[PDB]
Design a protein around this ligand. Structure first.
Ligand SMILES: *[C@@H]1O[C@H](CO)[C@@H](O[C@@H]2O[C@H](CO)[C@@H](O[C@@H]3O[C@H](CO)[C@@H](O)[C@H](O)[C@@H]3O)[C@H](O)[C@H]2NC(C)=O)[C@H](O)[C@H]1NC(C)=O
Ligand SMILES: *[C@@H]1O[C@H](CO)[C@@H](O[C@@H]2O[C@H](CO)[C@@H](O[C@@H]3O[C@H](CO)[C@@H](O)[C@H](O)[C@@H]3O)[C@H](O)[C@H]2NC(C)=O)[C@H](O)[C@H]1NC(C)=O
Ligand SMILES: *[C@@H]1O[C@H](CO)[C@@H](O)[C@H](O)[C@H]1NC(C)=O
Ligand SMILES: *[C@@H]1O[C@H](CO)[C@@H](O)[C@H](O)[C@H]1NC(C)=O
Ligand SMILES: *[C@@H]1O[C@H](CO)[C@@H](O)[C@H](O)[C@H]1NC(C)=O
Lengths: 214, 43, 160, 37
């Protein structure tokens, strides 16, 4: 039976700087039989790449978008949203949406991999951890971890503040087509309105024929 | 846990609505046939 | 005289049922094509919404039901054969739709088996929505096939 | 969740009302047909 595919990033940071090298690996148990090519979709466009690992030596602004990988005989993998900016300081995150009791890694990175020291991480404009150089990966994330995050650090000896990024830590209610869950209620409501109109017409005709067939 | 209950609820609601719509269509057809037959026979 | 006497109202009732089923199928097809026809989702999960089956089947059902309803009023004493042929071809259409429906159902069952956390992403959720649509369309197609086979056997009995 | 729950509740009330009305109308039309026979 066909299996699901998964896409991994090297480095796993979904936010990278311009010109950085990122490798996208799509191994979703493709070894069911023989080796096979891969299908890559970027903004609904089938790129001419059919390799397991896609390498972007010089990431650009246009490289950002929606990335979906699919192996032959397997379903499409989960989409990955790549975000590339050109700021002095960036707050790289492993993922944008984290489930309950999940784990996600956050790291503050400087331009051209410059030395960054005395980094303070603020959540909802409130500092929660002061890290010298180590990442601030959080384990067992709860609903209280949802909010906006941004890291403020020192590039060489100059103070800089990274752009604010919103990370939503919620339950399994990922949502998107929950209004399509109202499609069945809307359809049955429309059907009941049609039935009510039919009943009105039926009772009017019944009264008319009662005055007729009396 | 939570979504399957509303899934089954919507499924049974649609089934009951379809059954009721078929019943009402049958009733409308029967009453129209009776009315037209009575009108043709009396007039 | 069993069905020979029972058909007088059953023909109209099953024609109305066919019209209703066609209308619901057309509504489902339009909604899915307008909303759930993005390139991000895979093609195997949307097996029904790939060959134009919903629109074609809805059109055939609507045409057959309208012809049956018009013929039930004894219009020109000619539409009986046309309605019989329309429902005869609608029987094969409903059989093909049932085959497509069961294929989509088993594909969605395989996809849900691949899913582990029960709608942990957009793909599993849209697969669940697609299989709900598959079950609903299977029920509607069973009803429509019963209507078509009853109408066809009744018209065959009349034309003999 | 709660939205579809309250929709189900109001639609069940509507369906019960419609079923009662249909039963009354069917009883009336059956009595009329019996009297006609
Ligand atoms: C497919 O969609 C993606 C978005 O997921 C597009 O990337 C977005 O557009 C450009 C990259 O070409 C980035 O620059 C920004 O463009 C906007 C206009 O959309 C402009 O107002 C800004 O000033 C800036 O120049 C944009 O940041 C990027 N989006 C993200 C979130 O990074 C991509 O271009 C699309 N594909 C094609 C072929 O256009
Ligand atoms: C991808 O990266 C871009 C950065 O290039 C993100 O855009 C940033 O979004 C935040 C919102 O959380 C913006 O902050 C807000 O900016 C407005 C501007 O008027 C300000 O009034 C607010 O008080 C707040 O500071 C930030 O400016 C914006 N950055 C840029 C360069 O436009 C984007 O959110 C990331 N994600 C996606 C999915 O695009
Ligand atoms: C992609 O396909 C082409 C043509 O089939 C082939 O020449 C190329 O080697 C493939 N790419 C990889 C990475 O194998
Ligand atoms: C801050 O980050 C460190 C990582 O060095 C981690 O051990 C700690 O639990 C985090 N939180 C606090 C309140 O220190
Ligand atoms: C989450 O945050 C809110 C407001 O910041 C607070 O009232 C609540 O107690 C927090 N949750 C827990 C479990 O402490």
């Amino acid at each position: 039976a066909t299996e699901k595919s998964v896409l991994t990033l090297d480095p796993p940071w979904i936010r990278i700087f311009t010109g950085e090298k990122v490798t996208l690996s799509c191994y979703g148990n493709n070894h069911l039989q023989m080796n096979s090519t891969t299908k890559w979709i970027h903004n609904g466009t089938v790129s001419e790449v059919n390799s397991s690992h896609l390498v972007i030596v010089s990431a650009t602004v246009q490289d950002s978008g929606k990335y979906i990988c699919q192996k032959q005989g397997l379903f499409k993998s989960k989409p990955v949203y790549l975000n590339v900016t050109q700021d002095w300081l960036l707050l790289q995150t492993s993922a944008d949406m984290v489930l309950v009791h999940g784990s996600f890694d956050i790291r503050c990175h400087g331009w051209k991999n410059w030395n960054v020291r005395k980094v303070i991480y603020y959540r909802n404009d409130h500092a929660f951890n002061y890290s010298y150089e180590s990442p601030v990966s959080i384990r067992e994330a709860t609903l209280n971890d949802s909010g906006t995050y941004h890291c403020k650090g020192y590039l060489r000896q100059v103070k800089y503040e990274s752009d604010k990024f919103r990370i939503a830590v919620v339950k399994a209610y990922k949502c998107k087509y929950y209004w399509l869950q109202l499609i069945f209620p809307l359809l049955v409501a429309i059907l009941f309105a049609v039935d009510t109109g039919l009943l009105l017409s039926t009772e009017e005709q019944f009264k008319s024929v009662l005055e007729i067939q009396k | 846990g939570e979504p399957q209950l509303c899934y089954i609820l919507d499924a049974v609601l649609f089934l009951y609505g379809i059954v009721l719509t078929l019943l009402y269509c049958r009733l409308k057809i029967q009453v129209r046939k009776a009315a037209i037959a009575s009108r043709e026979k009396a007039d | 005289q069993t069905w020979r006497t029972f058909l007088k109202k059953e023909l109209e009732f099953l024609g109305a049922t066919q019209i209703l089923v066609g209308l619901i199928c057309l509504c489902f097809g339009t909604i899915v094509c307008s909303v759930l026809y993005v390139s991000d989702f895979d093609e195997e999960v949307l097996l029904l919404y790939k060959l134009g089956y919903p629109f074609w089947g809805a059109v055939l059902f609507v045409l057959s039901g309208f012809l049956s309803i018009i013929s039930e009023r004894k219009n020109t004493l000619y539409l009986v054969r046309g309605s019989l042929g329309a429902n005869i071809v609608s029987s094969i259409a409903a059989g093909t739709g049932i085959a497509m429906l069961i294929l989509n159902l088993t594909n969605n069952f395989a996809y849900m088996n691949n899913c582990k956390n029960v709608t942990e992403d957009d793909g599993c959720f849209v697969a669940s929505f697609t299989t709900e649509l598959v079950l609903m369309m299977l029920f509607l197609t069973i009803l429509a096939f019963c209507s078509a086979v009853l109408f066809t056997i009744y018209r065959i009995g009349q034309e003999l």
